[PDB]
Structure formats: structure tokens, C-alpha cells
Amino acid sequence: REEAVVWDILDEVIREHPVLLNRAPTLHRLGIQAFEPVLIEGKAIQLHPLV
Amino acid sequence: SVTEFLKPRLVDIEQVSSTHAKVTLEPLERGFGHTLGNALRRILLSSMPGCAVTEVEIDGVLHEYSTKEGVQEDILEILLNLKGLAVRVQGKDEVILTLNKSGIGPVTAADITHDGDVEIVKPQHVICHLTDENASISMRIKVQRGRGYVPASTRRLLVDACYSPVERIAYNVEAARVEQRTDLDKLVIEMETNGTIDPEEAIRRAATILAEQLEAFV
Amino acid sequence: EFLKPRLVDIEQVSSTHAKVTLEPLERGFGHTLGNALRRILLSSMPGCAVTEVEIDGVLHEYSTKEGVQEDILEILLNLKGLAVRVQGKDEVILTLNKSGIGPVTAADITHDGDVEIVKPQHVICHLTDENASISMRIKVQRGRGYVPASTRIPIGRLLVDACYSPVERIAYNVEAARVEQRTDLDKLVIEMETNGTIDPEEAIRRAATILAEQLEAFVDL
Amino acid sequence: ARVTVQDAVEKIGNRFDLVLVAARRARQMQVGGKDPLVPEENDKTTVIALREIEEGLINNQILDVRERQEQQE
Amino acid sequence: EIKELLKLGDLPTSGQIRLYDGRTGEQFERPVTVGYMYMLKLNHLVDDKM
Amino acid sequence: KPLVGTGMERAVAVDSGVTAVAKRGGVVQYVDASRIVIKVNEDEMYPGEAGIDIYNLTKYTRSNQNTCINQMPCVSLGEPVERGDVLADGPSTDLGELALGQNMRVAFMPWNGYNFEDSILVSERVVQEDRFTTIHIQELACVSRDTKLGPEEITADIPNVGEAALSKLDESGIVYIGAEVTGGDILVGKVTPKVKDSSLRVPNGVSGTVIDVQVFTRDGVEKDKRA
Amino acid sequence: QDVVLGLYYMTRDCVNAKGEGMVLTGPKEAERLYRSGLASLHARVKVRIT
Predict the structure, then answer these.
(1) Which protein family is named in the record (chain G)?
(2) F72, C163: Cβ pair inside 8 Å?
(3) Cα torsion for B103, B107, B110, B111, to the nearest 10°?
């Protein structure tokens, strides 16, 4: 249902949990890194530009 | 629900010791963080009622690119050091001061004549160095009240009067969320002054100016 | 010690839009209040966009009514292009009933008291038949910003996008004021565009009200 | 609130004993008992374990002495 | 021929008009190329992908 | 109407027959979103078997990339037309010219790094004018086979579901035309006889509004009231 | 690509503009000048750094 309490719970469970990001043609070992998520509206992954 | 806008109140003032200031504001309506940042930035930047150094003459020097012996530094360099000087003044408009001293050593801001009204805020700041037993320093510093940054060409050796007490003003905008709220703005004011006034009161003075400029409207 | 401006001039240079003038202002306040008022007058104003329209002979929004030439969707966009003024209510229902061969403009809407149309000659749609009558009931309510129908969401009540904005085109140009025994006085000229729903004096006054409340957020009055 | 684990590697230079020591301590702090010896910032026991690494008071030796003494008790 | 068509209009010949930020509200230096491009939407829509 | 065209939109918009190509010229008597009636000029038209013409427009219907294919009339009422010309505009056609996307006001400047690699930035004015707004059509299928322990009933009686899940149905269990459906509600109640729910739902995460219900039935079975 | 363009534009020396040929005690008032518009972005100026 995505009620009023669940989003605060999601911001609880993210805060210090890394995830792995991965472009599919993985050439070398910077093809996969780790990031701490920050929740963004919309439907597309925002990604730090230098990386 | 057309008049209501989400009035922020300042969640914290992470202030660092004397004049370094980091002031945050949240939550804000979509867009208004930039107009508040730009308004407070331009108002604190170009229009602040303050006082500074305006013109200094040397009693034995009639040129900018000149020197007096016994001094490790130059007169352009002490123009930089006098631009760094920070003074609060009583409601009298102008007053002349001086630096009449004969003595070996660094010349500090406390070794200026005190002269009643004028309160030097940083006695630890050093103007110039003297080293010889007979090299005497003597000049005539003239403060003035004003409301901006007045350069030399816009206007005896001239001093650009940085009347505004602020030294760095900058603001970033990050996202800050309330319950179901999609995109609400957050104002982060990072700011340094010269220490002639505490920074939060300077923010309130700038807001007071713009409040009068809107008091004419509504 | 700064010189406060006053609402010195309002000039209805056209039926849609007008120019206003701020005078006198000091140095630095020109671009300051110019960017400020431009950003507020684009950002958040009152408005009277169209929200929900219930056309009678319509099941869903992608059908096509017999006797009108356009799609019903294009009729909905032409209803979106409508401008309307209210005074005292936050919502209202309107009425359109018309048959016969001819264009169908907003001037055929029932012209109930505080409801006011400022562009009557705008077309909604055309017809083709002697006897095929469109008949729609239009809910118009107040609002602010942009409310797409996916957010806030009967089978006949269609939902269109909310276009709460009285303005499109805002500009400001600074210049000098009169001599007046004091130079560096800045004449602020705001040139705005309005469909005809909000008076420019009311617009600039509400803008000042909003930005004054946002300064009220921490400084006292 | 933690961005780099550089100082953790400055205290244990092997960078893989880092992972085992921090994981062992954070497991023993996760499910039950043996409270963290640092103030927390409403953050998970991963960041707590690495933070107690960078305070120096966690390595393989402290876990050896404490697990051995809990065995003795 | 493009210069002649621009000269028919009110726009300057080089096409580089000065513009203004909404954030700062002041003039960018080095006036910029604006205009009207015909653009297209492609069928890689995000909710198909995500 | 693309600004910087090539002069090749005419031949494309004529020969790719998504528009209403006038087989004979004349004067248009009747215009509708459904159809266009063509009264032919007399010299262009046979003495015997004479009559007039009617062009049926193709309405909202499914494409093959699940986009929208639809025609719209471009000629006003009572109008001279010439033989071999468009009469109604279809998908991405305007007045006999191929109009794929839209012309927009555009600027080339680095803006806060939001355009970092190749990132096109779009102002909110574009989505407020609803002018990248597009239409997709999904064809959701549901079948009624017959396997062991019974056939596959199309009733509305569904075990352990909310009445809100039932409320967007008829008496039988097929959705009314015009329901603003949401992701997860039931279109057709399909039950497995044991009995267990396996009814057709919306694919998860999309909106929509039902425009049409096709129903086919193999011969030998009675139909309910909605069929 | 973008940020390196902005940096290369930010450190270069035009021969003359507003503020060319004065002195400044610190980079804080350099930023205060550039946000004012009372100087160039870039002009060969003797300042104090540390």
C-alpha cells in the first residue's frame, strides 16, 4: 500500500547501507563500485559525474 | 491553501568560534531557497552600513611606489594591512586617526591612538614592522562611514573602503524532505564577517533593510 | 537611510499585459528586487485553472463524440487554454450547452456572477451538425504551481492537467531615475505578461506579501 | 556519517584483517549483547564497528582477550 | 542566406544573444547561441526500463 | 510542423498512407472525427454508378510498438480539395507534412553541470504545455481454457479479496469501459477450480484507462450479460 | 568535460578588463568582487595568498 510510515522506515534502513553499481560491459575492476544511496524522486538513478 | 507557504524556522546555527558562520534554513518552498540566498547575498554584499579605512597619507612620502627605511614591508603592503583593519565607530560620521610611533618592533592595531569613540576590534592584528632604532613611523588614517565596496578609481594614498563587515558569503541549496513532500528546498548560508559584528545580527540587519523595502509595498 | 520606492506607475499598454514601474531605488537593489519579483511572480501566484470536466455523452477521454469534428482530447486541451476569473469562492461549476453548425467559444458559457471570462473569442471546438449538441460541466478551482492528474488521483468525470499560472512572460529592466538633486537613483521597470486573470497591482502586492513572509521566517516585524 | 576508511587501515595495515575484525565485532554487537563503546549517530553497527576501529580500541587482540575471558566465565 | 534571413528579423547577425540566469539574475558573459531546434522523443521510456 | 524541414515531408506523408488521401477532388460536405464525406466535382465523376465518397478515419487503436495510431481531420467544413491530397492528419502528420517531434526553443550553455556528458535539460514549461505527452496502448490478454478438475470461470465471486477490488467491475467481472484503473486491480476474474484466485491484474507499476474490451468465445458456450 | 572547461575559463589572463591593476589582501574579497561585478573574473592582479 506504501502507507505513511513505510518511507521513514526506508530512510532508516538505507542511511548507512552500501549498494553496488554496475555498468554491464564490465571491462576492468572500476566497472563495479559501491555507493551509499540517497533517495531521489523520479525513476532514474542519479550518479556522481566524475565517477 | 493558496496563501499558505511553509514558513521555515532555523533548525540549527552551527556557528564556528568568532566570525565563521554556517546558518541553515529548512524546509522551504520549491524555488525560494535561491531567491532568499540571492537576496541576502546581494544585500549583505553591496549595501551594509559600516565603516572602514578611506585615505592615508605618509608625512614623508608623496608616491604610491615608494618606501621608508627601517620597514621590512612596503607602502602598498601596508595599504593591504590597513584594508585588513577593522573598526566600529560611534554615530559620528568621520574622524581622522594616526599611527605616530617611534620604536623597534611590529606595529599592532592596539598601538594606534585610542581616541574616544573608535573601538579597535582586533588588537592582535599587526600593521607593519619596524626594526631600526631611529626609523620613526607616522601617518594619518581617516575612517569614514559608508554602505558598499568603494574602489580606488571610483573615487595622499587612497584606501578602498570595504564598508560591509562580511568577508565571504555563499550559499548552497540541498534537498530537504517533509512527510509526503516531493521537492522542498533547504538554505545553507555559509558566511564569514570581519568580526566587527556577530554574523546572525548582520543577517537580521540585511533582512531589516529588505523588510523596509517591502514595508513600502504592503 | 535608503529611499523606499512606491508603486509609481501602472500602464495597461495592452488588454492582455501591462507594465509597472518601481521608483526610486538605490544601487544594487535593481537586480536584487528585479530577480526577486520575477522569481516570485513566476513561482507561486493564485490562479484559476480548469481541473475536472464532465462531458455528458462521453464514457472515457479517448472516445470521439458524434457531431464534433475534433477529438475530445483536443477539446480538453482547448479547455486548458481557457482563462477565467473568480473572486469569492475556491471552486465553482460551469455550464455549456450549444447545438447547431458553428464555432463554440467560451462566450456561450453561462456567465454566472463572480465567474468571469477574459478571452471570450477563444475557440473550444467546432461542430458539423444541425442536431448534435456538446454539453459539458466544468469544475474550476483555485490552486498554485502545477498539479498533474497522476498525483492527486465516477466514470464520467474526466481529469485534465492543472495549469495554475496567471502569467507566462516576465521581464525587468533597470535604468536611472530623475535628477531630483540626487543621482544614482534606479528606475525599476517590470514588464510582465498576463492572460487577463490577475490585475498587475494585485500581482506585485501578493508577490511582496509572499517574500515578506519568507523574510518573516526568522527576522521580526 | 563516515566517508573514508583510510584511518582504519592506518591502524591495521593489512586491510583484510580489518574486514574480519570489524565483521566479528559487529556480529557480536548486532544480534545481542556487548554494547558499543562509542556514542552512536543513529547509524548501523557497520559504521559503529569501523568507528571503534578508528578509535583504536578494537583489534584482533581485544577480541581475543574478551572472548577468552567470556569462555573462562 | 541565413545571415540575410536573420537581417530580415530583429535578431543580431551572429545569433549570439545575451542571456540571464534565474538564480543570479545577472548577465552571463560571452553572449550565447540560442534558437529553435526540432527535437524528438525516443521510445526508450524510463518506466519501461526500470 | 517542423521548422527546418527538407521538402521531403510531402512525398513521405502522401505515400506512407497513414493519412486520408483524397482519391478524387471536390468539396467536403460533412466532417467528423469518425468520417469525412466527399462530394465530388461533376467532371471528375462517372455518369453511371455515380454517387459520392466516404473516408472512414481509423480511430484510437493499438500500434505495433504499443504507441498510438490515430487519425484526425485537418480540413474544415465546406472546403475545396484537390485530387490526390490529404484529408485527415494521422500520427505525426500535419496538413500533409510529416511532423515527428516538436520544435522547441533551445540553448547551448553549460548550466550547473546538469548537462554533464550529454544530458539534455528540459524546463518545466515543456511538460506544462503537455508537449512531450504521449499515448501508449497495451493489449492485456486473458484466456479461459479447460483443464482437469473443471473449466476456468469468468465470474466475479473471488475468494479473499477486498470489495474495492470488486467495485471496478460489472455484475459479471469484466471492467466497465472508462474505469481509471490502477496497478494491481482486477480486470477479469479468472478462477482455478480446486477454488483459487488467479485473476488478471494490471502489470505492476503502470497506470491506464480502459478504452475498449474485445471478447471472443469458442462456439459451444453461453455468454453472460456483458458479452 | 564541463568542469574542466569551467576551470580553464576560470584561470586565464585577459590583458584588460574591470579591476586590472589593483591590489587585494585576500581571495575572500576577490570572490566578493566577482560576485559584485565590480571587477573582471580574470585580470592580472597582485594579491596576497598564504
Answers:
(1) Belongs to the RNA polymerase beta' chain family.
(2) no
(3) 30
Compute the half-sphere exposure of residue G31: CA atoms within 13 Å on the CB side of its CA: 11
Residues of B in contact with E23 (CB under 8 A): 34, 38
Q: Does F116 touch chain G (CB under 8 A)?
A: yes
The CA-CA-CA angle for residues C138, C142, C145, to 5°, reads 115
Chain B CB contacts of A7 under 8 Å are 179
CA distance B149 to B159: 11
Question: With touching defined as 3+ CB pairs under 8 A, do chains C and B touch?
Answer: yes
> What is the crossing angle of helices B32-46 and G27-36, to 10°?
110
Distance from the E22 Cα atom to the nearest Cα atom in chain B, whole angstroms:
9
Q: Is the dihedral of CA F42, F43, F47, F52 positive or negative?
A: negative
What is the C-alpha separation between F82 and F177, in angstroms, rounded?
40
The residue among C170, C151, C175 whose CA lies nearest residue C161 is: C151
Indicate if B174 and B128 belong to the same structural domain.
Answer: no
Interfacial C residues in 11-40 facing E (CB < 8 Å): 31-32, 34-35, 38-39
What resolution in angstroms, rounded to 1 decimal? 4.4
What CATH number is associated with residue B30? 3.30.1360.10
Q: What is the dihedral of CA C26, C31, C32, C36, to 10 degrees?
A: 130
Q: Are C31 and C174 in contact (CB under 8 A)?
A: yes
Are the Cβ atoms of C209 and B218 closer than 8 angstroms?
yes
Q: Which domain holds residue F140?
A: 133-221
CATH of the domain at C94: 2.170.120.12
Q: If you count residue pairs, one on A and one on E, with CB atoms under 8 Å apart, how many are there?
A: 5
Q: Judge if C57 and C150 occupy the same domain.
A: yes
Is the same domain home to B111 and B85?
A: yes
Touching chains, C (3+ CB pairs < 8 A) = B, E, F
Query: Is some CB atom of chain A closer than 8 A to the CB atom of E47?
Result: yes
Q: E15: buried, middle or exposed (CB in 10 Å: 19+, 13-18, 0-12)?
A: middle
Contact F178 C70 (CB under 8 A): no
Experimental method: cryo-EM
Pick from F128, F177, F185 the residue to mutate for testing the C interface (most C CBs within 10 Å).
F128
Bond preceding residue C148 cis, omega within 30 of 0? no
> Chains with 3 or more CB pairs closer than 8 angstroms to D?
A
d(CA B13, CA G37): 30
Report how far residue F176's alpha carbon sits from residue F187's, in angstroms, rounded to the nearest whole number.
Answer: 9
| Interface size, chain B vs chain C, as Cβ–Cβ contacts under 8 Å | 100
The DSSP call for residue B107 is E
